[PDB]
Design a protein around this nucleic acid. Structure first.
Ligand SMILES: [Mg+2]
Length: 646
RNA sequence: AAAAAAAAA
């Protein structure tokens, strides 16, 4: 018969097709055999008669079954030649390789050159890779960095435009004063809950209070009661389900999963306002082992809105925070519990995969200024520990009550991927591990990292381990979370900005808090949808991560384009057939050193060790080597910084 | 070129 699979385009816009079969078989397809297909398209293909060159079969596309996109971002150009106007579009995406004939009836008379637009394909000629396109949206000035970020979101299918019906529905909502007197809702408004968040955030989902008892501690994790305001399958909910999460882009810019009157006002646990929450209350003994837990709706008043910067500076006795003594005692008790919890998590097995992370600072016109390294201090570590224990507790409560739910899962990595990792890292003098590769535990990977922290190449070690370990995702099947270290885990603590957390809250309400206010058909309708919700969230998480990486590259190469001629030190992060990727120390960005212009020899890529070796002199470039290199150009088409060795 | 845990965002 005929085969079917998804096309992925890479270097030079050749690529491969991943079949939909059981084996997920991979076939190579050269540019010349794409027959009009674009990156991400689902295609029908045939396997060519020609004998396999090696590695895998080569393929050709027969037809396109379903396009990955309907709109594409691009730059519109107009010029006058003779007495006739000429239109051109240059697609933002370098994998959009078709030559475009612009339908003139789609061009407003007032559309000026160098305007970012979105277009659709009206027709295509598979034999010449030329197509007719129509402008569908005018986005704005092509030189404005914010317009390019919005184009990137559009190119990744990420909704960002205001939805007028949804904003009007959200503006109708208000605080129901009578909800707090419900018998099922515990009044906790006297307790000294507080919030600790980055200084600029206005969506505050979580508040904490920790009390000491003679036998140990009681922790209160209060999470904004989003399900109270957002009814399932309402206009607001449907839009939230489409987004699946809030998006945070550089420089301030947030696309919220929920509109602002909810995300930053009615649900945000803002200081001094009465707010409805769902509380996970956990009592601990003096060893930090969970003794009991209860979940229940409540009312709170946050007493203080703190930043991470404020709490960390207070920790080092440099400055101090203006709050009641009950808050001070809760914060001190929260830190004691958090250090204690951290110790219990390491004992049970948990993999600390921390590494360098960055953010891009932009000015008032969205132009990038500099790159900052992020820190993850005690206060951020403290909140993280309390949020993890609540998430894990809720996962177990729902499982124990036999309620189907979406877990946050992370499977054990395969034996083959680990062995591949082991060989790669031996050239970096990372110890060979002693554990069994089929059975290796979280505890054993953590110990393995530990016996190597002082190695100069520990940073790239963690990078390679992170790729070996792979993606976490959501699943209704009760799979383990290998890197966190638990057999059951979910996302409960952030429903203002993640749709899964909202779903978890709904499950709590419908099965445990007020099952009597819902019918069995409501419970079964949600149960039947869980796997589709997990699928959409997983698919959209990929799009968001790709969107962030596009924006990081666009903004970082735009910033470096003004620093041509500076020399940067760094280390080799990857070796490819077309050259070396070097990660620059000062900005954590990978630049490309093209193979052809490496000095002193002619270098050949050898896939065996993933090195470049010089045909004479035996010079070897390998992953991890320290380098110094010159910034020679910015490739604005592919958004790669190109470097030359010094 | 390829890709990633956790947490607050
Ligand atoms: Mg928070």
């Amino acid at each position: 018969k005929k085969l079917q699979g998804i096309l992925t385009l890479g270097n030079k816009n050749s690529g491969f097709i991943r079949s939909l079969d059981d084996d997920k078989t991979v076939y190579y397809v050269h540019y010349s055999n794409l027959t009009g297909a674009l990156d991400g398209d689902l295609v029908e293909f045939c396997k060519l008669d020609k004998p396999q060159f090696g590695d895998k079969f080569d393929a050709a596309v027969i037809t396109i079954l379903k396009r990955a996109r309907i709109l594409y971002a691009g730059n519109f150009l107009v010029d006058q030649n003779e007495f006739a106007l000429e239109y051109k579009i240059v697609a933002d995406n370098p994998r959009f390789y078709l030559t475009m004939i612009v339908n003139p009836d789609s061009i407003p008379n007032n559309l000026a050159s160098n305007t970012k637009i979105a277009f659709q394909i009206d027709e295509y000629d598979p034999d010449n890779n030329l197509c007719k396109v129509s402008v569908q949206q005018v986005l704005g000035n092509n030189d404005d960095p914010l317009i390019n970020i919005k184009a990137i979101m559009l190119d990744n299918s990420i909704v960002f435009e205001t939805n007028d019906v949804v904003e009007q529905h959200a503006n109708k909502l208000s605080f129901d004063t009578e909800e707090q007197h419900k018998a099922y809702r515990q009044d906790l408004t006297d307790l000294a809950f507080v919030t600790v968040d980055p200084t600029t955030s206005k969506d505050l989902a979580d508040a904490i209070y920790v009390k000491t008892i003679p036998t140990g501690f009681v922790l209160y994790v209060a999470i904004a009661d989003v399900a109270h305001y957002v009814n399932r399958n309402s206009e607001i909910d449907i839009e939230a389900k489409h987004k699946t999460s809030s998006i945070y882009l550089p420089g301030h810019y947030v696309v919220p999963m929920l509109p602002e009157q909810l995300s930053n006002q009615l649900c945000s646990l803002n200081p001094a306002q009465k707010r409805y929450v769902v509380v996970c209350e956990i009592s601990f003994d003096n060893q930090g082992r969970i003794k009991t837990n209860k979940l229940y709706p409540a009312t709170i008043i946050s007493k203080n809105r703190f930043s991470y910067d404020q709490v960390n500076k207070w920790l080092n006795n440099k400055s101090e925070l203006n709050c009641d003594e009950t808050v001070i005692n809760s914060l001190k008790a929260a830190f004691t519990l958090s250090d204690l919890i951290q110790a219990q998590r390491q004992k049970r097995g948990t993999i600390d995969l921390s590494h360098k992370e960055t953010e891009i600072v932009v000015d008032e016109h969205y132009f990038p200024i500099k790159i900052n390294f992020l820190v993850h201090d005690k206060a951020e570590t403290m909140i993280e520990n309390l949020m993890v224990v609540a998430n894990e507790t809720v996962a177990w409560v729902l499982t124990n009550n036999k309620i189907a739910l979406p877990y946050r899962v992370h499977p054990r990595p395969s034996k083959k991927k680990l062995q591949s990792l082991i060989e790669t890292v031996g050239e970096l003098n990372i110890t060979k591990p002693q554990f069994n590769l089929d059975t290796v535990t979280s505890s054993q990977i953590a110990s393995w990292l530990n016996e190597n922290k002082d190695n100069p190449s520990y940073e790239i070690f963690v990078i390679l381990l992170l790729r070996t370990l792979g993606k976490a995702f959501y699943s209704v099947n009760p799979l383990m979370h290998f890197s966190i270290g638990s057999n059951h885990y979910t996302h409960f603590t952030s429903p203002i900005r993640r749709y899964i957390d909202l779903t978890i809250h709904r499950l709590l309400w419908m099965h445990l808090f007020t099952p009597d206010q819902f019918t069995d058909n409501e419970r079964d309708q949600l149960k039947q949808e869980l796997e589709k919700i997990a699928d959409t969230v997983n698919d959209t998480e990929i799009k968001i991560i790709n969107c962030e990486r596009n924006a990081n590259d666009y903004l970082t190469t735009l910033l470096l384009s003004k620093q041509i001629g500076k020399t940067f030190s760094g280390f080799i992060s990857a070796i490819t057939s077309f050259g070396i990727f070097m990660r620059m120390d000062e900005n954590n960005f990978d630049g490309l050193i093209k193979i052809t212009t490496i000095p002193d020899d002619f270098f050949i890529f050898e896939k065996e060790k993933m090195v470049l070796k010089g045909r004479k002199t035996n010079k070897v470039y390998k992953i991890g080597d320290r380098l110094e290199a010159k910034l020679s150009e910015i490739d604005f088409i592919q958004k790669r910084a190109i470097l030359t060795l010094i």
